[PDB]
Design a protein around this nucleic acid. Structure first.
Ligand code: MG
Ligand code: ZN
Ligand code: ZN
Ligand code: ZN
Lengths: 48, 78, 59, 258, 44, 29, 181, 115, 466, 432, 59, 66, 48
RNA sequence: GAGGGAACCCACU
């Protein structure tokens, strides 16, 4: 994230602990929601 | 002063119907004009539809405080 | 500490049960293992071990 | 006043089957006549077995099953014979049952073939059909084995058990050229023609008749031996008419009570 | 009571307090008689 | 004489039948 | 409302999950009240505006008149009020949906009833419901770990995932040029 | 264990009525005949003989469950005519048809036998 | 070699002479890593694109990669491999004649089919499994049709009239053992017919069917509460305690044999075999040889089942929807080949890898007998007589009856035996036990919000206490 | 004695279970809250728990030997909780994914598709027979869709009587052409593939899994949302009964003639397979001449295997697509697929054209021997048949190497099931 | 039962189709299921997964 | 075990035809011609005689206990 | 031991308190019935 | 009108 010409907004990880240590608890809440949604909806399955 | 929902929830509907049915099965005074039905739960059903069930729901708030709602004070649209 | 299931009551339900039980092999591997490698149909089972006949479930 | 006027054309009549054609009747009437062939023509079959000795390799219920499946000649006796439920005796008078006995002992090195010839009935009118082709095998006995038993055969139809089914196979057909399009062939050139087809060898289906209804029905009623096939069809028509008469009786009583 | 021997097929009178052994051939396996009871099969 | 392909099915099932006439199925036990 | 929507949904996905199906309710009103779509309608646009305002006041999720309560109530029904205003426009109800006065009043009553039937019942065990809603599909489930092992890597907070990865987005013309990428 | 005796497919137990009539109060001149211990045989012939009646507006039958043995026949007639007379005339026409069929079958059997 | 093996009885030529002739060779797994196998001798023939010209060995027949239970499957290569594995599992649970001397044997559980048939569609490996001498199924007439809806989701519709004629009828033999064990000087268990005047600890059941030697005799009908062995133990008025052997619960039957002997310890020892005739019933599990297991969903009589123009009604009707996702094309080819074999009089060959048998050849053969080439027939509705618009794929298919009968699994409880320690209901239907309302049922009733039903299951209906 | 048979008001009689008794019905594993639902007892004369078919989907139940548990609520309070919280009609739409869980199933789904087609016409007797099984019928026979030459009713006209209330719904059939909506025939479908329900009447369209199934926005879903749970219960029952009796008339089968393709299709499929194997040999000789390009992020063997797998999967999809477009409208595989009742399009592909590549841990068949997959192959053989590509259909029958590689492929799936159940169960328990 | 013909086995109330291959222990027919052991006396080299040894060779 | 009395599918008597079928087979009829000579025209009866295994001959090799 | 009595899925807490054997329950094979409504289960007479 | 536990194996969904 610190490097030049790297977008410091949309650059993200699939590592949950790394996101918690770097960006916080609400950020890792959002990241955990995104990762769980990816796992669930890879099949095309939908959970509310 | 009463902040809870004015609609009677499905859990309240189920428990009020069961309690009223057990009371009618234990010879509580029916409060509707029953046209020859035997089932206490059907009697409780049509007392609830006629909004004449003599039960008060004590909705406990997370504080420990409570609100007392009449069964006839609630909405039984569900 | 003794291995169990080495001797079994012979299945006598039909003749196919009897022959299948009399021609049975067992991998002494715990049936709770989440690794799939001893359970896989290995290429070297050709002509020695039946590729279709195996239990369903934990074994 | 809207009854049909059906016609009958017997096309074959042997000791074992009858092939006939019924015209000018509904599909439901023809199908119900077929169902009464299979299920509701009363014949006489063994329904009560007491086994005294059974040293054979076959157990007693298995022998009783094989005895019940043996056809017995029910011609002109099943009309006189009475149902056990409609009889007055305690159990199995001669007016409601026919008694059979079997008593075979094997004391020879040759295997004894206990067949339906060994059923000795107490009534000449009701005998095993093959005793009236080989005999229906019941059991085989090696030297040292015996079978002693006593059975009674009661009247019933095939709605109760399939041993009282008088028919071997009821072949039934209508519209053999598929003019009504009741079945739709994806490729009608792949389909063999019917026995009753009236088509030239180039054609597969008849032209579609838009105003047609099933009106000609082909039967091949085969008998297992208990009744003559013409007796099967006559008893079926009489039984279905009797059932409709009984239903009309209860219907009239229910109308008058209302 | 009356027990068929398991191999020699002859009846043996065996009451209580008599050890199970065939008198004709000393075989140790015997089988009870079929009953005289009225058992009734529907031929079904 | 080499076994021609029209006789091969009969030949292979004959030698298999010979194997199962001698060895049998529970021979290993 | 459109600027708020484009903030909320930057990817442009217009598919949302909302309580009352307004398009089907409008179609229901058209069929119930026999609305001829080729005739002028007796529905004043000011009735549409004021009815949507009163209905939006009538769909309460957070109760009270505290400004905290007002802000929470505004937030809890932000998408539904945006969608209700976007669907029951005075323009759309005039030229597209063509509903009458009776049909619009029935529509407002129907949206009220079907929103109030959608509010979560207190006492509902929603944690067990969520656990059964996330574990039942698990029975039917770059070397990115996915499926059940990634689910286990997520709910058991693992210090070492199997394939930890980054998704580096590039800021500027290095996003376009392959060579400075 | 739970096997019913086979005679329950055709024998009425005591206290069971063969045929009951109820008024189908959905439409005028419609009756439901529940016929016990009967099956698709009578239901089919009675429905098809009732369908040939031009005063009958509706004729249908159903088996509510194959494990039970009752027939429901719904009949609706024109107001000039009753479903009870419709049912009675249907059974009468069926008995007439079967009588004619039986005597013609006897004649044809005799004619084939004498040849 | 083939000529000499053709007369194996009168040359004394055998397999061992082939081994001695340098013709066949035993190859194990490490040595198979250094050989170059030919699948058939057709691989040895020179090809336009020559794959290998240095074959070291050749396979005798590739269908010897299968085991005993997978060699019963007709056309295994036309089936999906999970279905081959399922049939390998369920051919061991099929019902047939398990051994020839089943009358001598007192097995704890035995199942004997009334009329086992050899399959019309066999593989050539089934000759060496002796399957045509101890067969385990019947060739049904199977229509793969949608009829009345009672065959949906793996179920089948059986013919009641066929079942009445002995179709898949069987016997279940159960043997009970009991011995007069001498437990010291005091506890002397003895086979005596119990009288209530001297015996305690009864289950209050009649002892009248017992003989005076304390044992029941063959030919006696018995029921779930009845007594078959009367054993009394002498305790140090009620000197004797009743330890009689009772029959299994809800098991009707007839005592088939009673055997009385001495065990190794010299005590009196008895085994009683009870025979129960199992007629096919709704809920009995029937399977084909392709993993198409199912339960009987309904039974229709002959006048109710659909019929061809010859009056042939199916014995079994299976759902079409059991085929597509399963991909058991071997089932369809077995029906076709069985139709051909039953018309021709042959026994069809369905060895897995056989170029001489293919679907087109069987179709032409079936068309040579006046049937449609793909096995379809014009079936008529049994209820109305009307032709079914679709033409139904019907043919002889080898079905087998599995041991999983419904009367051996049905269970219910109101109240009864509780466990000693935790005072909760018992384990299994053999002990009149209750069903486990486990933790996931608790979670589901939490998510339902049914707290009073949760209390009834987890407090009142299990172990209430104060 | 009758002194023990006296009943005072206030006593309890533990009577037997009778018709209409409310019970909780359950099948393990109890994954979600529609695995235990409330049912009404009906006494029927055999030894099994007879069950409806639409409810087989939430229970995850078939009838291949499944057993289920019945629990009888013992008080009136528990009976009312089950009646008002856990009954089957109250469990139609799941809270998990805001869609129905019961839908229309195997025979009913296939025959609804075959029933609401455009060219289905019913005579007077067939209509009255079907209306006998419609429990929510007002007694009026509708005016037929055709009055002369002969009065004929359509399947859509009877299903309009099945559809309850004034439901409005727009769906598409599974075979809806994508170019049709932007064409000149959007509101008049040439293929009858746009489903429109106006005022609870099936105006047009062929119903299928997309219309009557367990998906969001379907017809049973709209029935639940507008009409309630009791009306939707009657909707399910009416669909099943009416459609099962019409299927008694129509009939549905599957045969060996449904696995047959045309000879031109077989030539096309063999040509596609020969072309694909030629492409695979081309890639092998490109990698062997060091001409293959290693894509970034992958080693050379990984990109070689990816190219080979892409070629073979394109082969399977193209052969399958030709096979399943060659199918006639009378095909039964096609009927059960485009109804959505049972069978994927891959199942048609594998039955008719190509079983396809067999995979072990996602890669092709490993070199279990010394650099061979079987001893019938040369060493270092990376072609299709060597590493598990099955070029035969299930109708043609597999060759023995293909049979063994397919047994490896199926054994992989059986293993994956029998070792993923425990991990999934532990995850579910910890989530709870 | 070794060396007996089928008639000699039927005189002993045995089945000539019965394969043998099992034991009778307390009247119960017991089959010994074959067990897959690793082969002896052969050097096997494996890369140990996540261990202090990169490669190990056992005999 | 022993030949069924009736055909399962239709009910034609086939219990009197097993010994005739065996005698026709040992007279070197083919199985199709032997079935045709016995009047078994439907394949439901032809499978009944064709697929029969007559186990009772081998159960009679065991000396009788009773 | 007592700890073995309490611990495990077969122990006291999980095997006897979270879940337990119950009275008034039945189990048997299920078969289809298209003639029953969705809220209605066919029950054997012996179980009833 | 209700008197064993445990270990193990097989099987079922
Ligand atoms: Mg299942
Ligand atoms: Zn009498
Ligand atoms: Zn002796
Ligand atoms: Zn037959």
């Amino acid at each position: 994230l610190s490097e030049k010409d790297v977008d410091p907004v949309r650059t993200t990880s699939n590592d949950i602990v790394e996101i918690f240590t770097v960006l916080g608890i609400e950020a890792v809440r959002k990241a955990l929601e995104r990762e769980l949604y990816h796992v669930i909806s890879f099949d095309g399955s939908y959970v509310n | 002063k009463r902040i809870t929902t004015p609609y009677m929830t499905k859990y309240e509907r189920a428990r009020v119907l069961g309690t009223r049915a057990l009371q009618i099965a234990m010879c509580a005074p029916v409060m509707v004009e029953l046209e020859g039905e035997t089932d206490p739960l059907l009697i409780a059903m049509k007392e609830l539809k006629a909004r004449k069930i003599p039960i008060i729901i004590r909705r406990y708030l997370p504080d420990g405080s409570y609100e007392d709602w009449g069964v006839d004070e609630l909405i039984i649209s569900d | 500490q003794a291995r169990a299931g080495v001797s079994q009551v012979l299945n006598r339900l039909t003749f196919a049960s009897t022959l299948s039980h009399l021609r049975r092999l067992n991998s002494p591997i715990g049936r709770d293992g989440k690794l799939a490698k001893p359970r896989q149909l290995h290429n070297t089972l050709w002509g020695m071990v039946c590729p279709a006949e195996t239990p369903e479930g934990h074994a | 006043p809207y009854a049909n006027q059906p016609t009958v054309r017997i096309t074959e009549l042997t000791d074992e089957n009858v092939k006939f054609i019924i015209e000018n009747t509904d599909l439901a009437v023809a199908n119900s006549i077929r169902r009464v062939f299979i299920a509701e023509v009363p014949i006489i079959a063994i329904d009560w077995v007491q086994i005294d000795a059974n040293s054979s390799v076959l157990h007693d219920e298995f022998i009783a099953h094989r005895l019940g499946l043996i056809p017995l000649t029910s011609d002109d006796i099943v009309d006189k014979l009475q149902y056990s439920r409609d009889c007055t005796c305690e159990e199995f008078c001669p007016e409601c049952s026919v008694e059979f006995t079997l008593d075979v002992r094997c004391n020879e090195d040759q295997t004894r073939h206990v067949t339906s010839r060994d059923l000795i009935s107490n009534s000449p009118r009701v005998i095993p059909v093959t005793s009236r082709q080989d005999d229906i095998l019941i059991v085989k006995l090696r030297k040292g084995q015996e079978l002693r038993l006593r059975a009674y055969a009661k009247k019933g139809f095939g709605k109760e058990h399939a041993k009282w089914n008088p028919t071997a196979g009821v072949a039934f057909e209508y519209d053999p050229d598929n003019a009504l399009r009741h079945t739709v062939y994806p490729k009608p050139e792949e389909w063999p023609k019917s026995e009753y087809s009236e088509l030239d060898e180039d054609e597969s289906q008849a032209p579609y008749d838009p105003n047609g209804k099933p009106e000609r029905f082909y039967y091949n009623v085969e008998s297992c031996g208990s009744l003559r096939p013409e007796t099967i069809v006559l008893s079926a028509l009489s039984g279905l008419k009797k059932k409709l008469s009984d239903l009309q009786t209860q219907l009239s009583h229910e109308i008058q009570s209302d | 009571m009356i027990y068929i021997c398991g191999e020699c097929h002859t009846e043996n009178e065996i009451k209580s307090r008599d050890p199970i052994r065939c008198r004709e051939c000393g075989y140790r396996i015997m089988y009870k008689k079929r009953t005289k009871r009225l058992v009734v099969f529907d031929a079904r | 004489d080499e076994i021609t392909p029209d006789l091969w099915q009969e030949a292979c099932w004959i030698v298999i039948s010979s194997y199962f006439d001698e060895k049998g199925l529970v021979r290993q036990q | 409302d459109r600027e708020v929507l484009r903030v909320i949904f930057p990817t442009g996905d217009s598919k949302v999950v909302l309580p009352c199906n307004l398009l089907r309710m409008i179609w229901n009103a058209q069929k119930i009240f026999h609305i001829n779509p080729r005739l002028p309608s007796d529905l004043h646009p000011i009735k549409v505006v004021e009815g949507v305002k009163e209905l939006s006041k009538k769909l309460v999720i957070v109760n009270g008149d505290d400004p905290l309560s007002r802000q929470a109530q505004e937030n809890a029904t932000l998408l539904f009020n945006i969608h209700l205003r976007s669907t029951l426009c005075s323009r759309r109800m005039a030229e597209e949906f063509r509903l009458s006065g009776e049909a619009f009043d029935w529509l407002l009553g129907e949206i009220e009833s079907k929103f109030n039937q959608a509010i979560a019942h207190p006492g509902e065990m929603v944690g067990a419901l969520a656990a059964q809603s996330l574990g039942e599909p698990a029975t039917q489930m770059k070397n990115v770990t996915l499926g059940v092992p990634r689910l286990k890597e997520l709910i058991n907070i693992s210090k070492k995932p199997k394939t930890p990865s980054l998704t580096v987005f590039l800021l500027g013309q290095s996003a376009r040029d392959a060579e400075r990428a | 264990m739970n096997a019913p005796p086979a005679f329950e497919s055709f024998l009425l137990f005591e206290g069971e009525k063969k045929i009951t009539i109820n008024k189908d109060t959905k439409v005028p001149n419609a009756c439901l005949f529940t016929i016990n211990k009967e099956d698709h045989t009578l239901g089919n012939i009675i429905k098809s003989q009732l369908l040939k009646d031009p005063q009958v507006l509706f004729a249908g039958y159903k088996v509510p469950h194959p494990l039970e043995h009752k027939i429901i026949i719904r009949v609706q007639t024109t107001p000039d005519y009753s479903p009870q007379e419709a049912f009675t005339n249907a059974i009468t026409d069926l008995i007439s048809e079967l009588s004619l069929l039986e005597e013609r079958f006897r004649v044809a059997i005799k004619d084939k036998q004498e040849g | 070699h083939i000529d000499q093996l053709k007369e194996r009885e009168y040359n004394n030529y055998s397999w061992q002479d082939l081994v001695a002739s340098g013709v066949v060779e035993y190859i194990d797994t490490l040595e198979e890593e250094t050989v170059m196998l030919a699948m058939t001798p057709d691989d040895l023939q020179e090809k336009e694109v020559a794959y290998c010209s240095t074959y070291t060995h050749c396979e005798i027949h590739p269908s010897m990669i299968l085991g005993v239970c997978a060699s019963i499957i007709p056309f295994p290569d036309h089936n999906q491999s999970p279905r081959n594995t399922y049939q390998s599992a369920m051919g061991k649970q099929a019902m047939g004649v398990y051994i020839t001397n089943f009358h001598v044997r007192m097995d704890t559980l035995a199942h004997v089919l009334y009329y086992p048939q050899k399959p019309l569609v066999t593989t050539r490996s089934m000759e060496y499994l002796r399957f045509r001498e101890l067969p385990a199924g019947i060739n049904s007439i199977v229509a793969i049709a949608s009829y009345t809806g009672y065959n949906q989701e793996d179920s089948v519709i059986m013919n009641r009239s066929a079942v009445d004629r002995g179709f898949f009828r069987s016997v279940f033999y159960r043997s009970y053992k009991e011995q007069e064990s001498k437990k010291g000087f005091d506890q002397e268990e003895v086979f005596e017919k119990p009288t209530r005047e001297t015996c305690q600890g009864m289950r209050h059941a009649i002892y009248d069917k017992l003989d005076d030697d304390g044992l029941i005799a063959p030919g006696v009908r018995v029921s779930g509460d009845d007594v078959i062995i009367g054993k009394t133990v002498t305790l140090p008025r009620y000197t004797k305690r009743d330890c009689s052997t009772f029959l299994r619960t809800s098991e009707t039957g007839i005592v088939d044999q009673v055997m009385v002997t001495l065990n190794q310890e010299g005590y009196k020892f008895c085994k009683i075999r009870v025979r129960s005739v199992r007629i096919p019933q709704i809920g009995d599990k029937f399977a084909s040889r392709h993993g198409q297991k199912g339960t009987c969903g309904i039974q229709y009589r002959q006048e109710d089942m659909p019929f061809t123009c010859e009056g042939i009604t199916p014995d079994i009707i299976i759902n079409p929807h059991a085929i597509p996702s399963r991909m058991t094309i071997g089932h369809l080819i077995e029906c076709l080949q069985g139709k051909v074999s039953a018309n021709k009089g042959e026994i069809g060959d369905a060895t897995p890898f056989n170029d001489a048998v293919n679907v087109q050849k069987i179709s032409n053969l079936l068309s040579d007998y006046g049937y449609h080439l793909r096995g379809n027939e014009v079936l008529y509705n049994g209820f109305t007589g009307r032709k079914i618009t679709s033409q139904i794929f019907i043919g002889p298919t080898y079905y087998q009856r599995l041991k999983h009968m419904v009367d051996d699994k049905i269970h219910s409880r109101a109240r009864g035996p509780i466990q000693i320690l935790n005072r909760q209901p018992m384990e299994g239907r053999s002990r009149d036990g209750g069903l486990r309302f486990g933790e996931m049922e608790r979670d589901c009733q939490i998510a339902h919000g049914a707290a009073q039903f949760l209390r009834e299951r987890l407090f009142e209906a299990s172990d209430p206490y104060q | 004695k009758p002194s023990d048979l006296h009943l005072q008001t206030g006593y309890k009689v533990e009577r037997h279970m009778c018709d209409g008794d409310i019970v909780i019905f359950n099948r393990q594993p109890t994954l979600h809250k529609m695995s235990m639902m409330g049912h009404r007892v009906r006494i029927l004369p055999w030894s099994t728990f007879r069950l409806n078919l639409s409810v087989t989907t939430p229970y995850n139940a078939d009838f291949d030997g499944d057993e289920m548990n019945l629990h009888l609520p013992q008080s009136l309070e528990t009976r009312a909780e089950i009646q008002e919280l856990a009954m089957v009609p109250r469990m139609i739409v799941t809270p998990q994914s805001n869609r129905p869980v019961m839908g229309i199933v195997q025979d009913t789904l296939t025959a609804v598709r075959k029933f609401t087609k455009r060219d289905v016409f019913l005579e007077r007797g067939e209509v009255m027979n079907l209306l006998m099984f419609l429990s929510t019928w007002d007694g009026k026979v509708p005016q037929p869709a055709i009055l002369k030459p002969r009065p004929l009713w359509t399947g859509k006209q009877i299903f309009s009587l099945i559809i309850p209330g004034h439901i409005n719904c727009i769906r598409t059939h599974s075979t809806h052409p994508d170019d049709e909506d932007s064409g000149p025939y959007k509101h008049i479908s040439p293929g009858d593939t746009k489903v429109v329900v106006e005022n609870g009447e099936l105006i047009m369209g062929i119903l299928c899994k997309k219309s009557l199934g367990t998906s969001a926005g379907s017809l049973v879903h709209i029935s639940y949302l507008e009409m309630g749970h009791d009306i939707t219960r009657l909707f399910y029952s009416n669909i099943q009964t009416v459609i099962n009796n019409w299927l008694l008339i129509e009939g549905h089968t599957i045969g060996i003639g449904d696995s047959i393709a045309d000879s031109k299709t077989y030539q096309d499929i063999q040509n596609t397979i020969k072309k694909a194997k030629q492409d695979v040999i081309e890639v092998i000789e490109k990698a062997h001449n060091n001409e293959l390009e290693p894509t970034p992020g992958n080693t050379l063997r990984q990109t070689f295997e990816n190219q080979v797998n892409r070629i073979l999967n394109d082969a399977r999809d193209k052969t399958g697509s030709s096979a399943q477009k060659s199918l006639s409208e009378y095909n039964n595989f096609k009927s059960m697929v485009v109804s959505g009742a049972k069978g994927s399009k891959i199942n048609i592909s594998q039955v008719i054209a190509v079983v396809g590549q067999q995979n072990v841990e996602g890669k092709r068949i490993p070199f279990g021997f010394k650099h061979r997959t079987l001893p019938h192959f040369i060493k270092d053989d990376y072609g299709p048949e060597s590493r598990g590509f099955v070029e035969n259909s299930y109708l043609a029958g597999l060759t023995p190497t293909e049979f063994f590689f397919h047994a490896m492929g199926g054994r992989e799936g059986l293993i994956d099931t029998a070792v993923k159940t425990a991990e999934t169960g532990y995850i579910q328990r910890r989530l709870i | 039962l070794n060396g007996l013909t089928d008639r000699d086995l039927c005189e002993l109330n045995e089945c000539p189709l019965d394969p043998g291959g099992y034991f009778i222990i307390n009247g119960s027919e017991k089959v010994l299921i074959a067990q897959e052991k690793m082969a002896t006396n052969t050097v096997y080299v494996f890369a140990k997964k996540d261990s202090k040894y990169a490669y190990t060779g056992e005999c | 075990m022993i030949i069924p009395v009736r055909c399962f599918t239709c009910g034609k008597i086939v219990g009197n035809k097993w010994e005739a079928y065996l005698g026709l087979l040992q007279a070197e009829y083919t199985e199709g011609d032997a079935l045709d000579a016995l009047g078994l025209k439907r394949y439901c009866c032809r499978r009944m005689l064709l697929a029969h295994v007559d186990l009772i001959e081998k159960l009679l090799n065991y000396a009788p206990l009773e | 031991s007592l700890k073995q009595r309490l611990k495990g899925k077969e122990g006291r807490v999980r095997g006897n308190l979270m879940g337990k054997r119950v009275d008034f329950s039945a189990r048997t094979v299920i078969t289809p019935d298209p003639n029953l409504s969705i809220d209605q289960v066919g029950v054997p007479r012996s179980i009833a």
